[PDB]
Structures are given as C-alpha cells and as structure tokens.
Amino acid sequence: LDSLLENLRAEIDALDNELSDLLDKRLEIALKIALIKQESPIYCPKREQEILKRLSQRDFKHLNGEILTGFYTEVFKISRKFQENALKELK
Amino acid sequence: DSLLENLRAEIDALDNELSDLLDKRLEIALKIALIKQESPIYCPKREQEILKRLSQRDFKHLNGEILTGFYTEVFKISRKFQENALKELK
Numbered sequence: 001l002d003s004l005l006e007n008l009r010a011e012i013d014a015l016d017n018e019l020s021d022l023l024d025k026r027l028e029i030a031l032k033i034a035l036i037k038q039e040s041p042i043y044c045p046k047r048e049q050e051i052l053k054r055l056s057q058r059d060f061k062h063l064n065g066e067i068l069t070g071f072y073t074e075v076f077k078i079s080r081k082f083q084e085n086a087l088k089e090l091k
Numbered sequence: 092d093s094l095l096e097n098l099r100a101e102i103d104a105l106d107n108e109l110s111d112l113l114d115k116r117l118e119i120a121l122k123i124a125l126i127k128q129e130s131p132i133y134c135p136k137r138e139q140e141i142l143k144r145l146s147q148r149d150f151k152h153l154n155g156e157i158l159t160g161f162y163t164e165v166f167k168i169s170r171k172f173q174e175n176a177l178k179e180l181k
C-alpha cells in the first residue's frame with residue numbers, strides 16, 4: 001500500500017539526487033580526461049560505442065538498447081560540450 | 092595512456108550505477124503509470140518542479156542548462172516508457 005503518488009514521487013526525487021550527483025562526478029572525471037589530452041576535438045566515437053555495447057549486455061528490468069542510446073546520446077553531448085568549454089577557457 | 096585507463100575505469104563504474112539508477116527510475120514511473128491510468132502522462136508542472144528543485148543543489152559542474160538538457164531526455168524516455176507500458180495492459 002505505500003504506493004501512493006506522494007511516496008513514489010519522493011522515490012523519484014531520491015533517484016534524481018543520486019543521478020544528478022553521479023552526473024556531476026562524471027563531468028569531474030571528464031574534466032580530468034580533457035586536461036590530460038587536449039585534443040582539437042574531444043569526440044571519441046570508438047569509446048562511446050564501446051560504452052554502449054558494454055552497458056547493453058548488462059541485466060536490466062526496463063532498459064534496452066534504444067533507451068540507452070537515447071540516454072547516452074545526451075550524456076555524451078553534455079560531456080563533450082563541457083570538455084570543449086573547459087578547454088576553451090583554460091588555455 | 093595510464094592515467095587515462097584509470098579515469099576510464101572510473102567512468103565505467105559511474106556508468107554502471109547511472110544505468111542502474113535509470114532502470115530503477117523507469118520502474119517507479121511504471122508504478123506511477125499504473126496508479127494513474129485515468130489521467131494524462133505529461134505533467135509539465137511536476138517536470139518544472141523537478142528541475143527547479145535540482146537547480147537549487149550544490150554542484151561542481153552541473154548548471155541549469157546541463158540539467159535541462161539531461162532531464163529533457165530523461166522525461167522523454169520516462170514518458171515514452173510509461174505510454175508503452177500502459178499499451179501492454181488490457
């Protein structure tokens with residue numbers, strides 16, 4: 001019975017705090033990578049596709065390849081732009 | 092490189108968790124779809140409330156632009172998923 005809307009939405013909220021915090025940490029790592037490389041462009045397509053491949057093989061209730069592809073397309077965009085901007089300003 | 096290999100191992104650990112968290116967030120949205128079958132999926136007030144709330148938190152790098160991008164896609168994923176899950180009921 002604790003599945004009322006209030007409670008499910010608090011659970012979403014806890015998810016979103018963690019998801020946000022993890023995304024923040026993923027940008028800090030991407031910052032470190034940008035700095036040790038400083039490539040003209042940051043785009044490493046082989047690596048992106050390796051990430052997706054590996055994650056696709058894992059066991060999920062609801063995620064599949066379409067959902068991961070959409071999710072990570074945005075994640076990789078966010079990460080790429082962030083690294084670019086970091087390199088523009090620190091130079 | 093060497094440093095590079097380690098940073099990428101960390102990304103990998105991160106991405107395992109980020110995926111696991113997204114899968115759990117789909118499960119909860121599934122529960123929500125099911126307790127709310129007589130109503131629209133798109134709740135723009137709630138989406139805005141989520142972003143506002145998350146914008147208030149302390150981040151090293153995230154800002155409003157980055158969260159908006161991220162969650163636009165998260166909400167799209169969540170919306171489509173709920174639709175399709177409800178299509179599998181009678």
Ligand SMILES: O=C(O)C(=O)C[C@]1(C(=O)O)C=C[C@@H](O)C=C1
Pocket residue numbers: 009012120123124132133134135137138165166169170
């Ligand atoms: O909280 C809800 O009402 C949901 O259905 C979940 C969610 C979300 O992904 O957070 C999904 C679709 C709506 O646009 C608003 C919120």
